[PDB]
Amino acid sequence: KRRVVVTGLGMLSPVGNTVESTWKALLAGQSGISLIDHFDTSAYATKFAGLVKDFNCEDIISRKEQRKMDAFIQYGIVAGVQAMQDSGLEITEENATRIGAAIGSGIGGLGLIEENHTSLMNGGPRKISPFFVPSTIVNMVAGHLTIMYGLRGPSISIATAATSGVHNIGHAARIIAYGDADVMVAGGAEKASTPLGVGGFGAARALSTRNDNPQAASRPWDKERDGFVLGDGAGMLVLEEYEHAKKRGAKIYAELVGFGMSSDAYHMTSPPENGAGAALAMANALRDAGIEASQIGYVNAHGTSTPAGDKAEAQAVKTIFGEAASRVLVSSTKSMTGHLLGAAGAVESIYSILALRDQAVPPTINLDNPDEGCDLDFVPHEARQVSGMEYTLCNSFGFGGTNGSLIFKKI
Amino acid sequence: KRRVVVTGLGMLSPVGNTVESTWKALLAGQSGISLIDHFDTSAYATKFAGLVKDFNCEDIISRKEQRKMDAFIQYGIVAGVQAMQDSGLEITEENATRIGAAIGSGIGGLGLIEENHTSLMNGGPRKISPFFVPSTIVNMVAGHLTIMYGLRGPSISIATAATSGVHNIGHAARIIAYGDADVMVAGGAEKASTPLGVGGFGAARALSTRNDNPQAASRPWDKERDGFVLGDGAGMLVLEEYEHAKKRGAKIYAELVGFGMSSDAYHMTSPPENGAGAALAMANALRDAGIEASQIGYVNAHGTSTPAGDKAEAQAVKTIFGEAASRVLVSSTKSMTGHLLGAAGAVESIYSILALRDQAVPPTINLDNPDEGCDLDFVPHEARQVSGMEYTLCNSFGFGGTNGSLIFKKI
Ligand SMILES: C=C1C[C@@]23C=CC(=O)[C@@](C)(CCC(=O)Nc4c(O)ccc(C(=O)O)c4O)[C@@H]2C[C@@H]1C[C@H]3O
Ligand SMILES: C=C1C[C@@]23C=CC(=O)[C@@](C)(CCC(=O)Nc4c(O)ccc(C(=O)O)c4O)[C@@H]2C[C@@H]1C[C@H]3O
């Protein structure tokens, strides 16, 4: 039976352009939310987001290649290179066939979709860029990274809205465990802070409109919450079969032990009050890992800061953890980072892993006045020191009622 | 060890709005390509495509729900309902948790992306539809079908350009075999025949521009070929664990025995001359199925009608089949249907299955003057009667160099 471990990490987020800088900022409760300045937000109900500050790909992507990629792909590539470098893995003719990728995005290249469509409206199809398709489609991060590293193994890209990051990581692990690969770079990337992204999610009445205090906007489980805050970035993990990792002397961050999936079968853009779908996904991951709920020390929640979404997950956690419900720590790092959509489950899996390494759990900031009758410990305001934590669980749910949960185990 | 079989089929294509009507047309060598009339093609270099004729969802999708979905989702839903009905499966509180979906698309809702962006350009973000996001994103076919049927099991959506259909079907099978589900509705849907789709792929110099003879445009392996022909539609299969199918008396079309994946690691929009990536995917599927190349009776090719793409796959088939290379039949149904992109591998898996049932293989029409020095039997012009065919193989390759192959076995 093939075990899967994590041997490399890469990340760009609204609170940092590296894995360690991001983690340090989160443990310090720092918000990465600010006013948007790259497009005129005068007519927009929401005028802020979690932006990647000073993104730099100068020594990573050539000038000729950059022009063929939407920002989401550039972010995904940079984070993937960080992960591959961190892993110390060396690609050879002999193992190239055994290394692949599972990397997705929820919405893909909105920026270049807008640019190409604007061009078409203004001057006809002759003005569409030859790069339109490959610069926008969701699977292009995987495409570029395999070419860059000479990876010939399986490559897939799961696009399940906010569940993407978790599904790609989960299936990369399945692929390795099944025997189709020994290593996979997996994760997600997103850059939806554009007119269509902000305007689109705004049209759905899904975003916080707290323009007067952007850093206090994302407040999961707080009574004054009014929708999610969009965040940009990318998270990538190098997953690897255990004996393969040991043989080459890899550094091992944690083990990936459980992966659960479910569907709400309720409504396209809202969960059932019950949180039955969320619960089933967590139950499935626990069964996959062969452990009980009481063994989980921390749950990095989906917790987007929407009125109904946050309540359903709290109900789901209560259902699954029962008597232990008050003893597990639960936090939503989206309180600081915003919602990275297709990259959310990827960066949040990284947070779940580092929590095991450092035995420290990041807080749900802004939780000033929690919804009434719920006795869960949402790690409000300040990071928490933990002691003999062996397992963490990461939840990611998505439009369409698609759910996913991953469980990581220390060492 | 859990075996996976096919118990239901659903399909909309340019040659028919049902599984049997489509198959009858293909065995008869009928083209489904015609001039586009739903948008003004005056300024477009390519003015034809494979369109779904007289699509009807009146008794399937309510008027209230139709307005929330791009055409690709409406096609995917109709084909999924056809498959679920064909399967005879009855969803209960007891099995709901064991039934899921793996359905994707390569490009998603171009039609409604254009409509929403046009609205934004003309009147600001206030004019974007509240349905923008859920009406366009790739995972919405899976989302709607799970809600419609009350499916609570795993739902994923793989978006790997033209490889989508094969990857979704392959991973649905993996999910069942692993134990995460007993049944999965899997496949793909696409409706990229819009200004951005035709103009976008046209900008890349990837489409045939034979406007004076649209039905002769798609001509895989023919010397006068000049790019692919875009096709719309959707293909869905109900996959099911073997003992589960038998117990309820399901009708069984074929068994899914092998699934292989690879990456070219060559170029974003073209394969290597070698076809090494295509070859590895077929090799992987053969190994997964535990059989030799000589046992395959028919290969339904990726064969899009591009100069370099068709040559690389012919080289790959020669590499894998060697001495048997001239004895296996190879055909590209895209010669009649056009390229359904994210749905191509789904409808083509259906063709691969029916070929086993009927012991008949559809032709590569338009193959008037085959490229020189290649001795493969591409089933030119006319369908072929076969005799003791036990295995078929379906190839699907995609931008980003991502490849996939599936192998189906009779009974
Ligand atoms: C149907 C409704 C009712 C409505 C009312 C209260 C709410 O909380 C929101 C604002 C968001 C629900 C949600 O959490 N969806 C939801 C979900 O199910 C799965 C994933 C996500 C995600 O962000 O990743 C998500 O956001 C909904 C959205 C739309 C309009 C609002 O009035
Ligand atoms: C890089 C080039 C060179 C060029 C020259 C000859 C060709 O054949 C085409 C027209 C298409 C190659 C191809 O088959 N890609 C290709 C591929 O790798 C994987 C999938 C598909 C698919 O359609 O699903 C596909 O189409 C390419 C496209 C672009 C411009 C042309 O001059």
Curated annotation (Swiss-Prot), chains A, B:
Any GO molecular function: 3-oxoacyl-[acyl-carrier-protein] synthase activity
Active site: 162, 302, 339
EC number(s) per entry: 2.3.1.179
Signal peptide residue numbers: none
Recorded superkingdom: Bacteria
Reactions listed under catalytic activity: a fatty acyl-[ACP] + malonyl-[ACP] + H(+) = a 3-oxoacyl-[ACP] + holo-[ACP] + CO2; (9Z)-hexadecenoyl-[ACP] + malonyl-[ACP] + H(+) = 3-oxo-(11Z)-octadecenoyl-[ACP] + holo-[ACP] + CO2; hexanoyl-[ACP] + malonyl-[ACP] + H(+) = 3-oxooctanoyl-[ACP] + holo-[ACP] + CO2; octanoyl-[ACP] + malonyl-[ACP] + H(+) = 3-oxodecanoyl-[ACP] + holo-[ACP] + CO2
Pathway: Lipid metabolism; fatty acid biosynthesis
Pfam families linked to this entry: ketoacyl-synt (PF00109), Ketoacyl-synt_C (PF02801)
Record keywords: Acyltransferase, Fatty acid biosynthesis, Fatty acid metabolism, Lipid biosynthesis, Lipid metabolism, Transferase
Matching SUPFAM superfamilies: Thiolase-like (SSF53901)
UniProt-annotated binding residues for platensimycin: 269, 302, 306-308, 339
Biological process according to GO: fatty acid biosynthetic process; fatty acid elongation, saturated fatty acid; monounsaturated fatty acid biosynthetic process; response to cold
GO cellular component: cytosol
Ketosynthase family 3 (KS3) domain span: 1-410
Residues at which platencin binds: 269, 306-308, 339
UniProt entry tagged with the keyword DNA damage: no
CDD domains to which the protein is assigned, alphabetical: KAS_I_II
Family from the record: Belongs to the thiolase-like superfamily. Beta-ketoacyl-ACP synthases family.
Self-association state and partner proteins as the record states: Homodimer.
Misc remark: Identified as a drug target. Inhibited by platensimycin and platencin, which are antibiotic produced by various strains of Streptomyces platensis, and by several platensimycin/platencin analogs. Also inhibited by the fungal mycotoxin cerulenin that binds in a hydrophobic pocket formed at the dimer interface.
Free-text function comment from the UniProt entry: Involved in the type II fatty acid elongation cycle. Catalyzes the elongation of a wide range of acyl-ACP by the addition of two carbons from malonyl-ACP to an acyl acceptor. Can efficiently catalyze the conversion of palmitoleoyl-ACP (cis-hexadec-9-enoyl-ACP) to cis-vaccenoyl-ACP (cis-octadec-11-enoyl-ACP), an essential step in the thermal regulation of fatty acid composition. Is able to catalyze the condensation reaction when CoA is the carrier for both substrates.
Name the record gives this protein: 3-oxoacyl-[acyl-carrier-protein] synthase 2
Organism, scientific name: Escherichia coli (strain K12)
Lineage of the species this protein comes from: Bacteria, Pseudomonadati, Pseudomonadota, Gammaproteobacteria, Enterobacterales
